[PDB]
Design an enzyme around this catalytic site. Structure first.
Site, PDB file in Angstrom:
ATOM      1  CB  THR A   1     -24.184 -33.257   4.631  1.00 32.85           C
ATOM      2  OG1 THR A   1     -25.541 -33.581   4.948  1.00 32.85           O
ATOM      3  CG2 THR A   1     -23.261 -34.356   5.150  1.00 32.85           C
TER       4      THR A   1
ATOM      5  CD  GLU B   1       7.999 -32.568  -0.372  1.00 34.02           C
ATOM      6  OE1 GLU B   1       7.942 -33.779  -0.063  1.00 34.02           O
ATOM      7  OE2 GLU B   1       8.653 -32.134  -1.349  1.00 34.02           O
TER       8      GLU B   1
END
Ligand SMILES: Nc1nc2c(ncn2[C@@H]2O[C@H](COP(=O)(O)OP(=O)(O)OP(=O)(O)O)[C@@H](O)[C@H]2O)c(=O)[nH]1
Ligand SMILES: Nc1ncnc2c1ncn2[C@@H]1O[C@H](COP(=O)(O)OP(=O)(O)CP(=O)(O)O)[C@@H](O)[C@H]1O
Ligand SMILES: Nc1nc2c(ncn2[C@@H]2O[C@H](COP(=O)(O)OP(=O)(O)O)[C@@H](O)[C@H]2O)c(=O)[nH]1
Ligand SMILES: [Ca+2]
Ligand SMILES: [Ca+2]
Ligand SMILES: [Ca+2]
Ligand SMILES: [Mg+2]
Ligand SMILES: [Mg+2]
Ligand SMILES: [Mg+2]
Lengths: 423, 54, 343, 438
Positions: free
Chosen positions: D145, D254
């Site tokens: 998963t 950023e």
């Protein structure tokens, strides 16, 4: 809720299956009447994998009992935990299979297989999310071998995306009932190659040698053999029955243990095998667990290479010391582990030990040395088949000699496939 | 060793110190791959049922 | 029972070390691609350092220091000595050298010619030597040097025109020292060195009497094996000669400078290559090459990262490698001078 | 203010996410019932902590988080855990049967059947957002998963949220705690398909966290609970700039600007210090110079490698506690004269520094000792490529024999995806070598 549906077929399958349910019921606190009387919540956390919960807090095994004779299943119903099974899950005929694969697979068994599938379907419908099936049977007889592999084929047809696991008892001339056992086993092995995801190879030759050589039993009985099987079956299903991180369901076990689809035949092992109050240390558990004398398949691991290995330690012990000994065995004998499967040895630990043991270890190896078992059966098959000896028992049920020739070729192909990865 | 862009607030401050100057597939394409893999699973399952029918 | 793997079949030093490890019955050799080893005798080029030290429950050790190539390359050594403050451009025991990239490719062509012209005007000796890690030209004209390099990176350093000449023979030599650095960065100097001597008289006006390589003296020198067996003078004979002729010892006149140079070079790169806090450990055997001039001043010529040993000294040195470098990490069931230093 | 949505996928992602939100609540003074006494704007607001927490009219601060797992037992720990009241059932998505450590099973077979439900539950959280920045995705490399469904989810998020940034926190497989031999397969498979969809990924090697727990916390056999509390401390250090007032790494964009100049090389190395055992009654508090020096010790990195034998592209220092800029610059100048800190020629040799005066919060009863100051360094080194070379080598060993490949093909995956994923990794190792080797 990852339920498993259990099926036991034939004499060997029902006697070993009955002992399995007797053993794990004790480990989970389930009394012979299905009432829980344990002292730890660990016993009920994964209880639904094998048990249905009924009215009155009763736990009923998700087990289907199959035979073409009533005898052995009457003994089960009269056994210690006989009353715990669902009465409608006893599916039996009267004719028997006469240690004849053809009778189990083509004639006598075909008449009964649909009523077994009706009970399988009823159990599957009451599963929140069925993960697959486990079958106990022998390969040397008629019902477990012939009808058992017929059942596996029809179950795969109806549930093609579920895992099929078997505990398959291999015949040996040391512990033999009839001379046709190599015929029945050879015909069954090809069925298992195609229609199971995982098969534990329980070799009666190994079970006898352990009782005689190690346990110092001069006259081993089928009861003594089933003691080793019962302890092994509890060990290899611990990760399914108790909380854990490794091989917690049948599909994850298959993904870890089976690098090639047909090479899914496992050599189990157990430690200790004591003939009894002395405490066993982690270095002793780890050395015995890898010893050939503790293997249940009568194959020498040093004659082949381990593709994958699972090891399960049970009891209160130093998990740090377990890792040290496990990494000690690998780093001291790394020539017996294939180098093209990195980190192919996985270790699990369970706190609850088996009944009557402070600690124990269970071995599950996918070794290429298992080809010795199939070679042994193949030679015994050919010794009779080159003279067509005893074939009339099978041609009289409609089989042709060509189906024997193709079974002979199929198992020699399996042996050859193990040989190419050993090199 | 120059400190530049010094900013101060109640909960902290930040600055930069320089030591030396220098010298996608669409929604359709994803559904196609998911369905192509599902079709290969359906073909393998049909071949199995064909084998079991024989 | 410790395990090890062998990944350099041409290494004579570690072919013997592998033989000694098996002779103790406590070391087992595995296939070269088996990652479950305690010790790797690694290959020379592209050793996979990044895959070491990631095996659970295995203390892993390798016979090479990652990054030590900066000391064991021609151009790398010159750059290292010039740019490191611990050694500095004013280093007194290394000949004035310059890195010269061929024109078919920073570079120091203009800096070399600047100092070259200072010697041409000042009447001083202006003989230089060009070489590389890959074919050596000695000349007095700077034009022949720069033109030969263009014909890989090369370096041009001052040729020591006034070497110490052994007598009888009036012949050139060079000193090889074997240094072992263990996982704790202890610096061990093998007490036994070798002088690889030229068998031809040194003519200051043919490269046979100017290059002291053991292969050149065995393929182009018409006096091979005349003065000493295989053009190899060991420390006992060289020390006796310095006493009889020069009234001094090998320890005082030469070995003090050798130990000083070895410490300086290895301490300089210690922060870059140390495995003190690393997930695997390293050791390595180095071969230092020294030149001695007529004033008994020692000059460093090169450092060899994969050196061979003298035939007489293989058994002693290889056993020493097992003792202080391998058994110190993996104990079983001094021929070195420890050059003490501050870590 | 701009919101961030956290997505936790698989057992590793969910259990790590549970440890992170536990720590976030302790850091922001949020009680298990979701109430935050210090928050005076009841029922709304655009403070810094609102990037991670929405608010109900009743004053409950609700994580902007989605938990996804193909098996219900791990997320059921969230439904009945200490912080159960934080979440509502729309945030917890469980399936019936997991991906069985099989990338193809999580990506194709089961992923196709649950991807629409997951995106719908994510869309409900995105509609609460006035200006969504993007997503933080927690998952393992090795699980079926965590590897298979994550890469599918990342593809669909790029389609449905094209302008949003996406960051990862990925658990790199370590055999000392791993549960599957095929985890190298799943790691390479999920990296290949996620590479162009992740702007910045923080890899955490379970091997490094395991040894830090044994060496610095004196835990003989660390468990997932020990590992996840340490990881959540590192994760908190990385996301603190998004949840508190400040000027460095204030939005997800950023992170890429300060740490990832080359988009494919978007795996910053994280190093954290100090890690001190709580059983030590009294430990001498390490100084700014000492914890900054410890940021260049391999024993403190989230991935074991040797930054000395690579080149830096960027470097951020994230301090928490009693730290002033004067002591930071003194430590950096000292370290420059003792460490082999080589930047690439096309990048300035500098450090972006962030300081938060609040010291690290420790979970009560945990293994970590409260310290006066701590630092997490985020450096983009080519040396982290050692982790790729280890992984790709284990891939090569198994794939040369096609071991276990039939499990993946049986789920509808073509065998060519194996070789295609591996070639992409070979190109990745080549990029790292061209940037950081002379
Ligand atoms: N650090 C840390 N690692 C974990 C944790 N849980 C699992 N892992 C690692 O994750 C890998 C296994 O992947 P999982 O996340 O457990 O599997 P999954 O994502 O649930 O996918 P499935 O196969 O469907 O179960 C192994 O390498 C584990 O060591 C955890 O809680 N903390
Ligand atoms: N600056 C210099 N002045 C005088 N002689 C020099 C010199 N540089 C080199 N030599 C001579 O040239 C010979 C070979 O030098 P160099 O060290 O380049 O060879 P090499 O590296 O192949 C030997 P090894 O096999 O030990 O590495 C030395 O024996 C030395 O005597
Ligand atoms: N280990 C074990 N093996 C058995 C047992 N009963 C039969 N076998 C073996 O199984 C084979 C006979 O098959 P059996 O199960 O009796 O025939 P079936 O009833 O037609 O399936 C022989 O190889 C026997 O050695 C048993 O209780 N334990
Ligand atoms: Ca009938
Ligand atoms: Ca508010
Ligand atoms: Ca994008
Ligand atoms: Mg019988
Ligand atoms: Mg050389
Ligand atoms: Mg899972």
């Amino acid at each position: 809720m990852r339920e498993i549906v259990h099926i036991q077929a034939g004499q060997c399958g029902n006697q070993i299956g009955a002992k399995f349910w007797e053993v794990i019921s004790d480990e989970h606190g389930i009394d012979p009447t299905g009432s829980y009387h344990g002292d730890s919540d660990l016993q009920l956390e994964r209880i639904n994998v094998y048990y249905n919960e009924a009215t009155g807090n009763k736990y009923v095994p998700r087990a289907i009992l199959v035979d073409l004779e009533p005898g052995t299943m009457d003994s089960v119903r009269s056994g210690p935990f006989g009353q715990i099974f669902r009465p409608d899950n006893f599916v039996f005929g009267q004719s028997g299979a006469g240690n004849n694969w053809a009778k189990g697979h083509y004639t006598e068994g075909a008449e009964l297989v649909d009523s077994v599938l009706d009970v399988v379907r009823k159990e599957s419908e009451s599963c929140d999310c069925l993960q697959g099936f486990q079958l106990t049977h022998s390969l040397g007889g008629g019902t477990g071998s012939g009808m058992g592999t017929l059942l596996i084929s029809k179950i795969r047809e109806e549930y093609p995306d579920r895992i099929m696991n078997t505990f398959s008892v291999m015949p040996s001339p040391k512990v033999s009932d009839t001379v046709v056992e190599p015929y029945n086993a050879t015909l069954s092995v090809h069925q298992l190659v195609e229609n199971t995801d995982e098969t534990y190879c329980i070799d009666n030759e190994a079970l006898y040698d352990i009782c005689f050589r190690t346990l110092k039993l001069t006259t081993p009985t089928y009861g003594d053999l089933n003691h080793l099987v019962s302890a092994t079956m509890s060990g290899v299903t611990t990760c399914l029955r108790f909380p854990g991180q490794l091989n917690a369901d049948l599909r994850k076990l298959a993904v870890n243990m089976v690098p090639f689809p047909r090479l899914h035949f496992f050599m189990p092992g157990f430690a200790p095998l004591t003939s009894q109050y002395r405490a066993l240390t982690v270095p002793e558990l780890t050395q015995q667990m890898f010893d050939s004398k503790n293997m249940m398949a009568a194959c020498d691991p040093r004659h082949g290479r381990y593709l994958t290995v699972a090891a399960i330690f049970r009891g209160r012990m130093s998990m740090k010391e377990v890792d040290e000994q496990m990494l000690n065995v690998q780093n001291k004998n790394s020539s017996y582990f294939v180098e093209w499967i990195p980190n192919n040895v996985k270790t699990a630990v369970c706190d609850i030990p088996p009944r009557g043991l402070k600690m124990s270890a269970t071995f599950i190896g996918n070794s290429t040395a298992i080809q010795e078992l199939f070679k042994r059966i193949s030679e015994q098959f050919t010794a009779m088949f080159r003279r067509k000896a005893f074939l009339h028992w099978y041609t009289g049920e409609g089989m042709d000699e060509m189906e024997f020739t193709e079974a002979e070729s199929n198992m020699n192909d399996l042996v050859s496939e193990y040989q190419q990865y050993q090199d | 060793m120059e400190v530049i862009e010094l900013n101060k607030c109640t909960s902290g401050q930040s600055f930069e110190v320089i030591l030396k100057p220098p010298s996608d597939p669409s929604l359709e394409e994803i559904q196609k791959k998911l369905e192509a893999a599902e079709e290969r699973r359906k073909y393998q399952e049909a071949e199995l049922l064909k084998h079991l029918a024989e | 029972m410790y395990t090890f793997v062998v990944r350099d079949e041409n290494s004579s030093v570690y072919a013997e070390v592998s033989r000694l490890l098996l002779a103790t019955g406590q070391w087992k050799r595995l296939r070269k691609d088996n990652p479950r080893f305690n010790l790797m005798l690694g290959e020379r080029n592209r050793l996979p350092f990044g895959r070491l030290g990631h095996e659970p429950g295995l203390v892993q050790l390798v016979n090479y220091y990652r990054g030590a190539d900066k000391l064991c390359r021609k151009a790398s050594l010159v750059k290292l000595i010039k740019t490191s403050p611990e050694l500095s451009e004013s280093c007194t025991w290394f000949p004035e050298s310059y890195v010269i990239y061929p024109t078919n490719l920073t570079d120091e062509r203009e800096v070399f010619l600047a100092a070259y012209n200072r010697r041409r005007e000042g009447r001083e000796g202006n003989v230089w030597i060009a070489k590389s890690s890959a074919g050596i030209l000695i000349s007095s004209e700077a034009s022949e040097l720069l033109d030969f390099i263009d014909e890989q990176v090369h370096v041009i350093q001052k040729y020591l025109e006034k070497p110490l000449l052994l007598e009888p023979g009036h012949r050139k030599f060079d000193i090889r020292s074997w240094v072992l650095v263990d996982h704790l960065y202890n610096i061990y100097l093998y007490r036994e060195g070798v002088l690889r001597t030229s068998s031809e008289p040194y003519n200051s006006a043919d490269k046979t009497c100017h290059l002291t390589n053991h292969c050149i003296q065995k393929e182009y020198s018409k006096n091979y094996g005349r003065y000493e067996e295989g053009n190899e003078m060991f420390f006992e004979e060289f020390n006796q000669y310095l006493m009889d002729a020069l009234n001094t010892t090998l320890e005082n006149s030469i070995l003090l400078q050798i130990k000083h140079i070895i410490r300086s070079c290895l301490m300089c790169i210690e922060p870059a290559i140390s495995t003190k806090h690393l997930h695997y450990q390293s050791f390595q055997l180095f071969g230092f090459d020294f030149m001695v001039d007529e004033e008994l001043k020692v000059w460093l010529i090169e450092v060899n990262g994969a050196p061979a040993c003298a035939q007489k000294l293989y058994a002693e040195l290889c056993q020493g490698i097992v003792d202080v470098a391998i058994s110190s990490v993996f104990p079983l069931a001094s021929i070195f001078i420890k050059l003490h230093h501050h870590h | 203010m701009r919101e961030c949505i956290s997505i936790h996928v698989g057992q590793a992602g969910v259990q790590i996410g549970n440890a992170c939100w536990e720590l976030y609540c302790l850091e922001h003074g949020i009680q298990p019932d979701g109430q935050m006494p210090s928050d005076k704007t009841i029922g709304g607001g655009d403070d810094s902590f609102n990037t991670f927490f929405s608010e109900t009219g009743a004053g409950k601060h609700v994580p902007r988080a989605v938990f996804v797992d193909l098996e219900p037992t791990v997320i059921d720990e969230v439904r009945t855990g200490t912080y159960r009241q934080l979440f509502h059932p729309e945030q917890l998505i469980t399936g019936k049967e997991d991906a069985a450590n099989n990338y193809a099973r999580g990506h194709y077979t089961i992923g196709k059947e649950i991807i629409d439900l997951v995106l719908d539950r994510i869309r409900k959280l995105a509609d609460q957002c006035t200006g969504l920045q993007g997503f933080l995705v927690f998952h393992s490399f090795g699980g079926g998963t965590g590897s298979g469904f994550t890469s599918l989810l990342m593809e669909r998020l790029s389609v449905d949220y094209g302008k949003k940034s996406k960051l990862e926190f990925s658990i790199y497989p370590a055999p000392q705690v791993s549960t599957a031999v095929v985890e190298p397969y799943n790691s390479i498979l999920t990296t290949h398909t996620t590479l162009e969809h992740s702007d910045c990924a923080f890899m955490v090697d379970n091997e490094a966290i395991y040894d830090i727990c044994r060496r610095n916390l004196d835990i003989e056999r660390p468990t997932y609970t020990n590992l996840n509390r340490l990881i959540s401390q590192i994760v908190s250090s990385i996301t603190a700039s998004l949840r508190f007032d400040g000027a460095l790494n204030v939005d997800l964009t950023e992170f890429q600007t300060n740490l990832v100049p080359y988009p494919r090389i978007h795996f910053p190395l994280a190093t954290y210090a100090p890690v001190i055992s709580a059983e030590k009654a009294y430990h001498e508090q390490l100084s700014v110079a000492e914890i900054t020096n410890a940021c260049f010790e391999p024993a403190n990195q989230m991935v074991k490698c040797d930054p000395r034998h690579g080149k830096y592209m960027a470097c951020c220092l994230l301090y928490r506690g009693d730290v002033v800029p004067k002591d930071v610059n003194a430590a950096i100048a000292t370290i420059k004269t003792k460490r082999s800190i080589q930047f690439v020629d096309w990048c300035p040799t500098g450090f972006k520094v962030g300081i938060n005066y609040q010291p690290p919060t420790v979970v009560p009863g945990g293994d970590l000792a409260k310290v006066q100051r701590a630092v997490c360094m985020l450096s983009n080194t080519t040396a982290i490529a050692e982790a790729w070379a280890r992984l790709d080598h284990k891939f090569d060993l198994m794939y040369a024999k096609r071991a276990f490949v039939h499990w993946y093909v049986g789920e509808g995956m073509e065998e060519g995806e194996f070789s295609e994923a591996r070639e992409d990794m070979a190109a990745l190792e080549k990029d790292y070598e061209e940037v950081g080797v002379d």
